[PDB]
Amino acid sequence: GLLSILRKLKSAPDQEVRILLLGLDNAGKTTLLKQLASEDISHITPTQGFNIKSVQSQGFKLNVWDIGGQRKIRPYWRSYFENTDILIYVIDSADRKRFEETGQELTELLEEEKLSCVPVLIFANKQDLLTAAPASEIAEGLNLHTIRDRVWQIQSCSALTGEGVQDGMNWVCKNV
Numbered sequence: 001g002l003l004s005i006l007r008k009l010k011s012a013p014d015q016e017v018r019i020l021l022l023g024l025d026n027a028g029k030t031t032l033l034k035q036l037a038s039e040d041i042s043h044i045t046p047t048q049g050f051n052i053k054s055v056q057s058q059g060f061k062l063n064v065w066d067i068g069g070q071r072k073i074r075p076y077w078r079s080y081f082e083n084t085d086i087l088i089y090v091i092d093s094a095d096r097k098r099f100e101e102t103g104q105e106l107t108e109l110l111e112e113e114k115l116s117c118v119p120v121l122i123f124a125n126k127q128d129l130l131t132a133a134p135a136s137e138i139a140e141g142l143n144l145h146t147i148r149d150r151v152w153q154i155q156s157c158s159a160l161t162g163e164g165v166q167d168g169m170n171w172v173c174k175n176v
Protein backbone atom coordinates (compact mmCIF):
# COMPACT_ATOMS: atom_id res chain seq x y z
CA GLY A 1 0.00 0.00 0.00
CA LEU A 2 1.55 3.26 -1.33
CA LEU A 3 -0.38 3.70 -4.41
CA SER A 4 0.59 3.73 -8.09
CA ILE A 5 -0.75 6.53 -10.25
CA LEU A 6 -2.92 4.59 -12.73
CA ARG A 7 -4.95 3.54 -9.71
CA LYS A 8 -5.28 7.04 -8.19
CA LEU A 9 -6.71 8.35 -11.46
CA LYS A 10 -10.15 9.94 -11.24
CA SER A 11 -12.41 9.93 -14.30
CA ALA A 12 -10.39 7.05 -15.74
CA PRO A 13 -11.50 5.70 -19.17
CA ASP A 14 -14.07 2.95 -19.69
CA GLN A 15 -12.40 0.86 -22.39
CA GLU A 16 -8.95 -0.68 -22.03
CA VAL A 17 -6.38 1.94 -23.02
CA ARG A 18 -3.29 0.80 -24.95
CA ILE A 19 -0.29 3.00 -24.16
CA LEU A 20 3.17 3.06 -25.70
CA LEU A 21 5.85 4.55 -23.45
CA LEU A 22 8.79 5.41 -25.71
CA GLY A 23 11.99 7.43 -25.66
CA LEU A 24 15.78 7.06 -25.63
CA ASP A 25 17.51 4.72 -23.22
CA ASN A 26 18.04 6.39 -19.82
CA ALA A 27 15.08 8.75 -20.33
CA GLY A 28 13.38 7.36 -17.22
CA LYS A 29 10.74 5.08 -18.77
CA THR A 30 11.19 2.13 -16.40
CA THR A 31 11.09 4.51 -13.43
CA LEU A 32 7.90 6.09 -14.82
CA LEU A 33 6.36 2.67 -15.50
CA LYS A 34 6.85 1.71 -11.87
CA GLN A 35 5.20 4.93 -10.66
CA LEU A 36 2.21 4.12 -12.87
CA ALA A 37 1.73 0.44 -12.07
CA SER A 38 2.83 -2.06 -9.43
CA GLU A 39 1.88 -5.18 -11.41
CA ASP A 40 4.62 -7.57 -12.52
CA ILE A 41 6.50 -6.61 -15.67
CA SER A 42 6.64 -9.03 -18.59
CA HIS A 43 9.80 -8.97 -20.71
CA ILE A 44 9.16 -9.72 -24.36
CA THR A 45 11.66 -9.95 -27.23
CA PRO A 46 9.93 -10.11 -30.64
CA THR A 47 13.26 -9.97 -32.47
CA GLN A 48 16.88 -9.61 -31.39
CA GLY A 49 17.56 -6.08 -30.19
CA PHE A 50 13.90 -5.28 -29.55
CA ASN A 51 13.32 -5.50 -25.81
CA ILE A 52 9.85 -4.73 -24.55
CA LYS A 53 8.62 -4.27 -20.97
CA SER A 54 4.88 -4.95 -20.79
CA VAL A 55 2.36 -4.45 -17.99
CA GLN A 56 -1.42 -4.76 -17.62
CA SER A 57 -2.83 -2.43 -14.95
CA GLN A 58 -6.02 -0.59 -13.95
CA GLY A 59 -7.60 -0.88 -17.39
CA PHE A 60 -4.35 0.06 -19.10
CA LYS A 61 -1.99 -1.98 -21.25
CA LEU A 62 1.49 -0.51 -21.41
CA ASN A 63 4.38 -1.47 -23.67
CA VAL A 64 7.74 0.19 -23.13
CA TRP A 65 10.90 0.13 -25.22
CA ASP A 66 13.86 2.30 -26.14
CA ILE A 67 13.64 3.96 -29.54
CA GLY A 68 16.57 4.82 -31.78
CA GLY A 69 19.14 2.13 -32.50
CA GLN A 70 18.95 -0.47 -35.28
CA ARG A 71 17.43 -0.03 -38.74
CA LYS A 72 15.72 -3.36 -39.53
CA ILE A 73 13.54 -3.56 -36.41
CA ARG A 74 11.04 -0.90 -37.50
CA PRO A 75 8.53 -3.37 -38.99
CA TYR A 76 8.38 -4.95 -35.55
CA TRP A 77 7.76 -1.59 -33.88
CA ARG A 78 5.02 -0.82 -36.41
CA SER A 79 2.97 -3.88 -35.46
CA TYR A 80 2.37 -2.21 -32.09
CA PHE A 81 1.54 1.21 -33.53
CA GLU A 82 -1.66 0.02 -35.21
CA ASN A 83 -3.63 -0.57 -32.00
CA THR A 84 -2.06 2.20 -29.92
CA ASP A 85 -4.45 4.66 -28.25
CA ILE A 86 -1.91 7.00 -26.64
CA LEU A 87 1.79 7.71 -27.12
CA ILE A 88 3.75 8.89 -24.09
CA TYR A 89 7.18 10.14 -25.14
CA VAL A 90 9.77 10.50 -22.40
CA ILE A 91 12.75 12.86 -22.51
CA ASP A 92 15.65 13.26 -20.08
CA SER A 93 15.50 17.04 -19.63
CA ALA A 94 19.09 17.15 -18.36
CA ASP A 95 20.63 15.33 -21.34
CA ARG A 96 21.27 18.28 -23.66
CA LYS A 97 23.77 16.29 -25.72
CA ARG A 98 21.00 14.01 -26.94
CA PHE A 99 18.16 16.52 -27.27
CA GLU A 100 18.68 16.73 -31.03
CA GLU A 101 18.53 12.95 -31.37
CA THR A 102 15.40 12.42 -29.30
CA GLY A 103 13.68 15.26 -31.14
CA GLN A 104 14.39 13.55 -34.45
CA GLU A 105 13.11 10.23 -33.11
CA LEU A 106 9.85 11.86 -32.01
CA THR A 107 9.46 13.57 -35.38
CA GLU A 108 9.87 10.21 -37.13
CA LEU A 109 7.31 8.54 -34.85
CA LEU A 110 4.73 11.19 -35.69
CA GLU A 111 5.33 10.49 -39.39
CA GLU A 112 4.35 6.82 -38.97
CA GLU A 113 1.06 6.17 -40.77
CA LYS A 114 0.14 3.58 -38.14
CA LEU A 115 0.29 6.25 -35.44
CA SER A 116 -2.00 8.67 -37.27
CA CYS A 117 -4.25 10.71 -34.98
CA VAL A 118 -2.77 9.19 -31.83
CA PRO A 119 -2.59 11.77 -29.00
CA VAL A 120 0.93 12.35 -27.70
CA LEU A 121 1.98 13.33 -24.20
CA ILE A 122 5.59 14.43 -23.91
CA PHE A 123 7.04 14.00 -20.45
CA ALA A 124 9.92 16.39 -19.85
CA ASN A 125 11.44 14.15 -17.19
CA LYS A 126 14.04 14.63 -14.45
CA GLN A 127 12.86 18.16 -13.76
CA ASP A 128 14.00 17.69 -10.16
CA LEU A 129 17.61 18.00 -11.38
CA LEU A 130 19.31 21.41 -11.21
CA THR A 131 20.68 20.52 -14.66
CA ALA A 132 17.26 20.09 -16.27
CA ALA A 133 16.50 22.28 -19.29
CA PRO A 134 13.30 24.38 -19.06
CA ALA A 135 10.17 22.64 -20.36
CA SER A 136 9.06 25.68 -22.39
CA GLU A 137 12.36 25.59 -24.28
CA ILE A 138 12.20 21.83 -24.78
CA ALA A 139 8.77 22.30 -26.36
CA GLU A 140 10.12 24.87 -28.81
CA GLY A 141 13.13 22.68 -29.54
CA LEU A 142 10.86 19.76 -30.42
CA ASN A 143 8.77 22.07 -32.62
CA LEU A 144 5.68 20.77 -30.84
CA HIS A 145 3.68 23.84 -31.84
CA THR A 146 3.87 22.80 -35.50
CA ILE A 147 1.84 19.64 -34.75
CA ARG A 148 -1.55 19.95 -36.47
CA ASP A 149 -2.45 16.31 -37.16
CA ARG A 150 -3.08 15.26 -33.54
CA VAL A 151 -3.57 16.64 -30.04
CA TRP A 152 -0.51 16.98 -27.82
CA GLN A 153 0.68 18.16 -24.42
CA ILE A 154 4.06 18.57 -22.75
CA GLN A 155 4.29 17.96 -19.01
CA SER A 156 7.17 18.67 -16.66
CA CYS A 157 7.73 15.74 -14.32
CA SER A 158 10.09 13.78 -12.15
CA ALA A 159 9.54 10.03 -12.42
CA LEU A 160 11.84 9.80 -9.40
CA THR A 161 9.67 11.85 -7.04
CA GLY A 162 6.45 11.29 -8.96
CA GLU A 163 5.84 15.02 -9.33
CA GLY A 164 3.79 15.93 -12.40
CA VAL A 165 3.20 12.34 -13.47
CA GLN A 166 -0.46 12.26 -12.43
CA ASP A 167 -1.09 15.64 -14.08
CA GLY A 168 0.23 14.13 -17.28
CA MET A 169 -1.98 11.07 -16.94
CA ASN A 170 -4.98 13.32 -16.30
CA TRP A 171 -4.41 14.85 -19.73
CA VAL A 172 -4.15 11.36 -21.23
CA CYS A 173 -7.50 10.40 -19.72
CA LYS A 174 -9.21 13.47 -21.19
CA ASN A 175 -7.93 12.63 -24.68
CA VAL A 176 -8.51 8.89 -25.04
Ligand SMILES: Nc1nc2c(ncn2[C@@H]2O[C@H](COP(=O)(O)OP(=O)(O)O)[C@@H](O)[C@H]2O)c(=O)[nH]1
Pocket residue numbers: 023024025026027028029030031032125126127128129157158159160161
Ligand atom coordinates in the same frame (compact mmCIF):
# COMPACT_ATOMS: atom_id res chain seq x y z
N1 LIG B 1 17.01 12.86 -10.81
C1 LIG B 1 16.18 12.08 -11.50
N2 LIG B 1 16.57 10.83 -12.03
C2 LIG B 1 15.66 9.93 -12.80
C3 LIG B 1 14.39 10.31 -13.04
N3 LIG B 1 13.75 9.26 -13.80
C4 LIG B 1 14.69 8.32 -13.98
N4 LIG B 1 15.90 8.66 -13.39
C5 LIG B 1 17.19 7.94 -13.34
O1 LIG B 1 17.64 7.82 -14.70
C6 LIG B 1 18.22 6.55 -14.91
C7 LIG B 1 17.48 5.83 -16.09
O2 LIG B 1 16.12 5.58 -15.76
P1 LIG B 1 15.36 4.43 -16.36
O3 LIG B 1 13.94 4.38 -15.81
O4 LIG B 1 15.95 3.05 -16.04
O5 LIG B 1 15.41 4.68 -17.85
P2 LIG B 1 14.84 3.94 -19.14
O6 LIG B 1 16.16 3.55 -19.82
O7 LIG B 1 14.32 5.01 -20.09
O8 LIG B 1 14.01 2.75 -18.77
C8 LIG B 1 18.13 5.77 -13.57
O9 LIG B 1 19.43 6.00 -12.98
C9 LIG B 1 17.02 6.51 -12.83
O10 LIG B 1 17.01 6.45 -11.40
C10 LIG B 1 13.98 11.66 -12.47
O11 LIG B 1 12.84 12.09 -12.63
N5 LIG B 1 14.85 12.45 -11.76
Ligand SMILES: [N+]
Pocket residue numbers: 140145
Ligand atom coordinates in the same frame (compact mmCIF):
# COMPACT_ATOMS: atom_id res chain seq x y z
N1 LIG C 1 8.53 28.51 -31.38
